[PDB]
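DATA SHEET
Item: assembly model
Revision: 1
Owner: S.N.
Input lines:
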Amino acid sequence: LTEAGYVGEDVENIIQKLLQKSDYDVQKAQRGIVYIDEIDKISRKSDNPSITRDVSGEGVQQALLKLIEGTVAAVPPQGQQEFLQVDTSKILFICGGAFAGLDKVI
Amino acid sequence: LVPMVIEQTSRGERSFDIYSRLLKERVIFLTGQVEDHMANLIVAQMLFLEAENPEKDIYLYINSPGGVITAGMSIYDTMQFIKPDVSTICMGQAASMGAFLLTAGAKGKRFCLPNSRVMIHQPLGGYQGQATDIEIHAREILKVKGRMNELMALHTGQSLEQIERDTERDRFLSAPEAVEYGLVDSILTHRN
Amino acid sequence: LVPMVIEQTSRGERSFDIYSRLLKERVIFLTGQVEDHMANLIVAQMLFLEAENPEKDIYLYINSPGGVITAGMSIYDTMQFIKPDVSTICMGQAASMGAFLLTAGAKGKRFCLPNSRVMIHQPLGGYQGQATDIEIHAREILKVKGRMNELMALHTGQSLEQIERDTERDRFLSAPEAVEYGLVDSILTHRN
Amino acid sequence: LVPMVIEQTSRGERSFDIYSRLLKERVIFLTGQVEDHMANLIVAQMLFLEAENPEKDIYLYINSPGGVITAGMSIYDTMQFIKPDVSTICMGQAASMGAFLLTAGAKGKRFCLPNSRVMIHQPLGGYQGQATDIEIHAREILKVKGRMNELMALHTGQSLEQIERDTERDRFLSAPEAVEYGLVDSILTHRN
Amino acid sequence: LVPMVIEQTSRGERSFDIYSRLLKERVIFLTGQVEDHMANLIVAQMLFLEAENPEKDIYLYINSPGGVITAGMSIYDTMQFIKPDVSTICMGQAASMGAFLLTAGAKGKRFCLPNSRVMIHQPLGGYQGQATDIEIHAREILKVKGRMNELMALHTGQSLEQIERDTERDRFLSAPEAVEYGLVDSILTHRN
Amino acid sequence: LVPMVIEQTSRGERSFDIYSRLLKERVIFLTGQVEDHMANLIVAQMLFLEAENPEKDIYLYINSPGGVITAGMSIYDTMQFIKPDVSTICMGQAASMGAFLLTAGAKGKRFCLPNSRVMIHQPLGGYQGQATDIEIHAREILKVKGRMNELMALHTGQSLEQIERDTERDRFLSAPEAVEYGLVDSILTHRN
Amino acid sequence: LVPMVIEQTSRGERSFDIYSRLLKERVIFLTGQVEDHMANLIVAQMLFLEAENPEKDIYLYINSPGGVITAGMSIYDTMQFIKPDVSTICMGQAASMGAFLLTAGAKGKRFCLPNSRVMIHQPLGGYQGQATDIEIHAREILKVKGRMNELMALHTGQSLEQIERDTERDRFLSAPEAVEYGLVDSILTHRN
Amino acid sequence: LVPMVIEQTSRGERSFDIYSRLLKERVIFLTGQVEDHMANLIVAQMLFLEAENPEKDIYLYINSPGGVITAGMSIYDTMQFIKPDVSTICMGQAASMGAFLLTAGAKGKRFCLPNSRVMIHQPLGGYQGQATDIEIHAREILKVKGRMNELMALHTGQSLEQIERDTERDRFLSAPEAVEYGLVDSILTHRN
């Protein structure tokens, strides 16, 4: 995942995979579950001042803020002419990571 | 040489020398003969610590056979000027100037190790030249002696006459004796 | 050994020596014998601080027994040349050159700690050689003596005649005595 | 010229000095004549190690021909004050001041190598001046000798009179003899 | 110690030495006795600044008490060779070599502080050996004296005979006198 | 000046000193006069190597004209204390102290170059003072001589009387002779 | 100290000292007495520059008052060995060895500043011992003198007899005189 | 100081000192007097180069006036022990110890500059003491002289008797003469 407007993958691509499991049904996709992995890698890499925009780091978190809380995302029709609208207000998002070094902070 | 230590922080590991590491903890070392150059380092450190936390105390470890009076006075004035209370701990020994700075700490925050000696004596000087210049320098040192006795009397709490008679010649005091005299307030034997 | 300090800033964390850290706050230390090398170093700091912000006052701490006049005049000229005011604070002692630079600060911004020894005396020199060369150097040092007396009289405010009589022999002035004499403006006892 | 070592950890490669690397293992080296500067360095290291782990023991290898009494007492007081038990290992030699610190370690943790010499002698001093000043200094050193003997008697377990008689003149002891005398309690022949 | 300063740039923050930072501004310091080692250092700085911008003038601060003529001549030739105009400012004092280099700057860009002193004298030398060698060295120094007088006359603008008469013995010149004599162009008393 | 070397590793690039690079390979250099400061550096290296890997041999290169006995014994005890075998290689020369450490290596790991000198002699010392003090130091030096002779016999395999007779005066032994005498095990002339 | 400059090279920004920055441009400085340590440093730089570009010209500034012939000869051999031409520029002074290296530059690439002094003299030496040893050293110094004279004639173009006759005693040659004598090719006054 | 150079490689740009830069190309510098400290430095470099590539020859530049025989022997043994061939090049001069190491290189890989000077002499020493101990040292120096001559004859190829006759007193050999004597294989005059 990466911030919008870059070569990297977009956050909306996550919902695209969900549609496939739901037979491309928006009603069924608006009540599914999602398990994000490697969430500990998007953490700021000792760049709190934000000298450069962490598209692969902080940039991913910013885009996911509205996704976890709930927002009508525009997912590609299949995988831009239609931009199917999928509401993520009732979709659960699980985040799994290793957080190597977090023990020192605690 | 001075060893290097690593401090663990949330951001990451950082390398600092042994003395710099203790500086972050508001600890200042006063070792060796007191002079203008070493005095400025102490003054700069004390001023730097005041800005970081003008409320937390500052610890000053005194271990030296005295030194120049002018250089020592700069530390004393800085110690009294800065709002933070400066706690003085005597390690090994504290000569005339070292003892003056030891007793110049905040009330109730002047400590000394169980096995340490405190020495106090009148200022030592000297000048060679014309008789007219001798009187000028002779009177100047006399004023310093009187001024230092007044300051020591105020901190120790004893009468000015007592300080003059006791400081007329070299006087050695132990840790328990320093407490009774008033140079220090307590003795640190073991960590509770 | 100069201890290192950590400065926390939004841009990041940077490590600087104790002296460099105070330099960022427009603080310059003048300690030890006054010479061309140390004096030249002070000149660079003043010029650097002026470029950064020629509006904030520059603080100069003087604690030295004096030195060559030529080196001192270099600092005095720089202080008067740069538009920002150069606040002078005396800690410890201030000899002829130290006192001359101490009184050379901006009017109303010259301070001294309560326990400070300010000393002022006429220039010292000496030459060996042919009588013709002795006369040349004798006139040169005399001109320097008169030039320094005029400058000191200007900052102190006292008449040139009084400065000459007081500068003929070594004169020691305490912090309160320096205020009334005009060398300093006020005394810094405690913060706020 | 000291060699550099690399420490491997999850954070990454870390560069260290031979002495700095051993400091992480709670190992302090006491070498050369005991003085205030080197003594303060050891005091800082002991305090630093206490903060990291006030439970783990510190290993202070002692190899020195002795030194200043005041400087040595600062180390002795620090070892007794800090909660951790300081283990002293004698390698090469341990003179009066060095032997005093060797026997100042925690009970059951004062080690000595098979080939090492321990020398215990009374304090050495000297003063030049008037008779009144000589008596003050002569009496002061006597108190140090008496105080030093009492501390050694407590750690070694010998009677005060026995220590005074043995320390009246230089007395050399070997690793096995030091065990019976009480300076140490074991010999490190081979690692087990 | 040489303080360190931080320079703000678009790429980021770069730490520069006090003297190194001023070098970026085309400012070179000439302090202390003139010798071959420092002379080559100044020559390297002048050459480096010329390549960076051969159209911007270079500022040279002179506060040296003079030195070797050969070492100084290297600086003089370098200043005249490089196309950029070298501006010389006298701080503190300027002896024979210092004065020669001070007046060697580009016409109209030579400045002297109000209290700076300038002294000019004939070359100093000597030799021990056979009479033939004495004549060889005696003639060489004489040529240097004549060559230096001609160069000084060209920059100062005074007659060759006048320079010779004034250079027979040390001649101290103040800032106002240097302007009249032609050694400097103006006096920098204030920023504006 | 010690040249720097780069160690290329899959993880990344790294820089090391000439001696530091060899330290990673369990190699220690013993050069110059033997003293407490240099001895501690060697002891620290041995302790560091033991902690890194206690199952790998340590190579020590000896090239020195000897030195203090206490400093040397501090290294001898460390070799036997640590379980890793300490291989000793003689380069250039190995004097009394150097020879003692050369023969102190693990059996079968004592090597010497074809062109190397080995000298063994009784301990050298001296003391001045009262007759009573002379006896104390005289008896101690004699005990050290006997103790060193016993250790030499154990490592070399020679009888006590033979070592005493050969050690009474300086005895120079070449590399081939050192093999028969037992000071070394083999001679390394070429790499196979 | 040596100032540090920054080069805005492609792909990054690096900070190098003034001397290192000029070395990257094929510029070598030869300052001070000629000795083995400084001579080897120059030889290393010349060999390094050959690797980067064995075709670009190399510049060597000469401002030395001479030195050991053996140390200087090492530089001369390197200059004539490496394929790149070596351009010698005389700045300030150039003694016998310095002048010898000045003439060792490639034909048409030997320059000299206007106010530069070149002094050429026969080798200086000395030995004390037995008459037999005196003859050995006396013959060697004479051979070295003849060898240097032959090299001087080859580079300068003067006849061998002329070089020997003019080298008997110190011979001072100015910049224009050096061109006529053949020591240098041209004089650099201003950039054209 | 030592200039710093940048090396371009696949990883990126790396900063190296002049000596460290040449160490990568298997080039070792032997400058100044031969002693134990510098000798060990060369030994460490030779061993380091052997591990990096035991099939590439090592170049050793010898420019020294001699030194301790034991220190030089450590380098000689290392050169013969390591499988890689060591190429010796004489720059400036090569005294007894330097000449011995110069001729100790691999046959056919020994070079000398055209103006280099090589001198060979018998070992020099001395001892002060009794008649019994002096005989030991006086007998050891002869053994070193004999062993030194044997090695010199083996590498040079001349008979042992001839070496003794030529080594009795100082003998200077030029670059061409060294070739006939066998000390060098060829002379390097230009790069082809």
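QC remark: Residues 100 and 148 of chain G are 8 Å apart (CA to CA).
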